Design an enzyme around this catalytic site. Structure first.
Site, PDB file in Angstrom:
ATOM      1  N   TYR A   1      19.320  64.298   6.837  1.00  0.00           N
ATOM      2  CA  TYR A   1      20.034  63.130   7.313  1.00  0.00           C
ATOM      3  C   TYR A   1      21.135  62.770   6.297  1.00  0.00           C
ATOM      4  O   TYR A   1      20.882  62.776   5.086  1.00  0.00           O
ATOM      5  CB  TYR A   1      19.093  61.934   7.453  1.00  0.00           C
ATOM      6  CG  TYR A   1      19.597  60.779   8.261  1.00  0.00           C
ATOM      7  CD1 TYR A   1      19.902  60.932   9.596  1.00  0.00           C
ATOM      8  CD2 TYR A   1      19.651  59.491   7.736  1.00  0.00           C
ATOM      9  CE1 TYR A   1      20.210  59.839  10.384  1.00  0.00           C
ATOM     10  CE2 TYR A   1      19.948  58.378   8.507  1.00  0.00           C
ATOM     11  CZ  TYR A   1      20.263  58.566   9.843  1.00  0.00           C
ATOM     12  OH  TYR A   1      20.564  57.506  10.648  1.00  0.00           O
TER      13      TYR A   1
ATOM     14  N   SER B   1      14.482  67.604   5.015  1.00  0.00           N
ATOM     15  CA  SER B   1      14.533  66.247   5.579  1.00  0.00           C
ATOM     16  C   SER B   1      14.363  66.328   7.109  1.00  0.00           C
ATOM     17  O   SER B   1      13.487  67.057   7.595  1.00  0.00           O
ATOM     18  CB  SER B   1      15.821  65.513   5.062  1.00  0.00           C
ATOM     19  OG  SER B   1      16.346  64.430   5.839  1.00  0.00           O
ATOM     20  N   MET B   2      15.252  65.706   7.866  1.00  0.00           N
ATOM     21  CA  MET B   2      15.208  65.791   9.317  1.00  0.00           C
ATOM     22  C   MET B   2      15.505  67.213   9.806  1.00  0.00           C
ATOM     23  O   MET B   2      15.045  67.560  10.883  1.00  0.00           O
ATOM     24  CB  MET B   2      16.215  64.838   9.943  1.00  0.00           C
ATOM     25  CG  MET B   2      15.902  63.400   9.664  1.00  0.00           C
ATOM     26  SD  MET B   2      17.019  62.354  10.606  1.00  0.00           S
ATOM     27  CE  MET B   2      16.466  60.740  10.022  1.00  0.00           C
TER      28      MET B   2
ATOM     29  N   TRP C   1      10.983  65.384   7.260  1.00  0.00           N
ATOM     30  CA  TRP C   1      10.978  64.045   7.852  1.00  0.00           C
ATOM     31  C   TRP C   1      10.911  64.222   9.365  1.00  0.00           C
ATOM     32  O   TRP C   1      11.666  65.006   9.945  1.00  0.00           O
ATOM     33  CB  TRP C   1      12.241  63.296   7.439  1.00  0.00           C
ATOM     34  CG  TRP C   1      12.291  61.843   7.759  1.00  0.00           C
ATOM     35  CD1 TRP C   1      12.168  60.812   6.881  1.00  0.00           C
ATOM     36  CD2 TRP C   1      12.548  61.262   9.049  1.00  0.00           C
ATOM     37  NE1 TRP C   1      12.364  59.620   7.525  1.00  0.00           N
ATOM     38  CE2 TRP C   1      12.601  59.858   8.855  1.00  0.00           C
ATOM     39  CE3 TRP C   1      12.804  61.791  10.330  1.00  0.00           C
ATOM     40  CZ2 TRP C   1      12.892  58.980   9.904  1.00  0.00           C
ATOM     41  CZ3 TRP C   1      13.072  60.916  11.360  1.00  0.00           C
ATOM     42  CH2 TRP C   1      13.089  59.537  11.156  1.00  0.00           C
TER      43      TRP C   1
ATOM     44  N   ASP D   1       9.684  61.764  -4.405  1.00  0.00           N
ATOM     45  CA  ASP D   1      10.476  61.501  -3.207  1.00  0.00           C
ATOM     46  C   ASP D   1      10.099  60.130  -2.627  1.00  0.00           C
ATOM     47  O   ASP D   1       8.949  59.934  -2.238  1.00  0.00           O
ATOM     48  CB  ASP D   1      10.185  62.588  -2.176  1.00  0.00           C
ATOM     49  CG  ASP D   1      11.134  62.599  -0.994  1.00  0.00           C
ATOM     50  OD1 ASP D   1      11.754  61.535  -0.716  1.00  0.00           O
ATOM     51  OD2 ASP D   1      11.300  63.700  -0.415  1.00  0.00           O
TER      52      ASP D   1
ATOM     53  N   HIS E   1      14.079  63.384  -3.599  1.00  0.00           N
ATOM     54  CA  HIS E   1      14.187  63.885  -2.234  1.00  0.00           C
ATOM     55  C   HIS E   1      15.049  65.154  -2.185  1.00  0.00           C
ATOM     56  O   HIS E   1      14.865  65.937  -1.270  1.00  0.00           O
ATOM     57  CB  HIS E   1      14.801  62.834  -1.316  1.00  0.00           C
ATOM     58  CG  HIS E   1      14.821  63.084   0.157  1.00  0.00           C
ATOM     59  ND1 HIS E   1      13.683  63.493   0.819  1.00  0.00           N
ATOM     60  CD2 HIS E   1      15.770  62.882   1.089  1.00  0.00           C
ATOM     61  CE1 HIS E   1      13.970  63.571   2.124  1.00  0.00           C
ATOM     62  NE2 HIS E   1      15.207  63.178   2.318  1.00  0.00           N
TER      63      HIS E   1
END
Ligand SMILES: [K+]
Ligand SMILES: [K+]
Length: 262
Positions: free
Chosen positions: A58, A131-132, A156, A177, A208
């Site tokens: 993201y 992440s995403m 995520w 994170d 992260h």
């Protein structure tokens, strides 16, 4: 057997910045169903190789995950790193774009004038992301169980129930994170998967971005990501220990494994 490429691996060969093959890259001129793409490929892998599509996090762009491209390509994979249509695309959209990127790699593999003409075994594909983009990669694996492997970092998703994943999945997470914490994202995701080879690896001290371009643990992270993809996309049992072992590195803070033989 028939999918094995390159020399017998060692710890030193997997920890190095590059594998045995020479890498070239190009920008995709007309990306089809995703924002932009860079293709990394081995010029001289000595046979067709599998393809991998890598999706950033993201707000992020190819820069964040681009180190994977040369690192994997140099060991015998065609790698597409993408930008998403929007930096603010959600996991579901990232998955769709990821699969569109693999589809375009298949188009280019069949295009005589392309630099990757005939370099890809389209039956052997893998998915990665941060992440995403990691959430999206597990979605891809749920919807497309013939994918050979998934390697994700600080994943995520708005849900953690990935019991649907039957693909061999390696999850990196980052100790410190705060955005996708190990305890509420990566680890519940990991624990949800009952039906597959899997590994969970927490990197000490990491934010992260601990597995992103420029990170200080590319020896360990690269070794693991390459070994995983080699073991599972190539059925290369020369990589079974590298893929399935828990490294005793002082940069590893947690390691959990299931259905992964040494
Ligand atoms: K390159
Ligand atoms: K094109």
């Amino acid at each position: 057997g028939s999918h094995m490429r390159g020399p017998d691996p060692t710890a030193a060969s997997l920890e190095a910045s590059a594998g045995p093959f020479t890498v070239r890259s190009f920008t995709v001129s007309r990306p089809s169903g995703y924002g932009a793409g860079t293709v990394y490929y081995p010029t001289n892998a000595g046979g067709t190789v599998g393809a991998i599509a890598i999706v950033p996090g993201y707000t992020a762009r190819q820069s964040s995950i681009k180190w994977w491209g040369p690192r994997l390509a140099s060991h015998g994979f065609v790698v597409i790193t993408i930008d998403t249509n929007s930096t603010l695309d959600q996991p579901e959209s990232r998955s769709s774009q990821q699969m569109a990127a693999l589809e375009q790699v298949a188009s280019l593999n069949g295009t005589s004038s392309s630099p990757i003409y005939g370099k890809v075994d389209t039956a052997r594909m893998g998915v990665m992301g941060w992440s995403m983009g990691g959430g999206g990669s597990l979605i891809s694996a749920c919807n497309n169980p013939s994918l050979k492997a998934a390697v994700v970092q600080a994943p995520w998703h708005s849900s953690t129930n990935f019991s649907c994943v039957t693909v061999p999945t390696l999850i990196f997470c980052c100790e410190n994170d705060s955005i996708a914490p190990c305890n509420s994202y990566a680890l519940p995701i990991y624990d949800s998967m009952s039906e597959n080879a899997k590994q969970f690896l927490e990197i000490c001290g990491g934010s992260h971005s601990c597995a992103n371009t420029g990170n200080s643990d590319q020896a360990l992270i690269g070794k693991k990501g390459v070994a995983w993809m080699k073991r599972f996309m190539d059925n290369d049992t020369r990589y079974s220990t590298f893929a399935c072992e828990c490294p005793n590195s002082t940069r590893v803070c947690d390691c959990r494994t299931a259905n992964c033989s040494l």
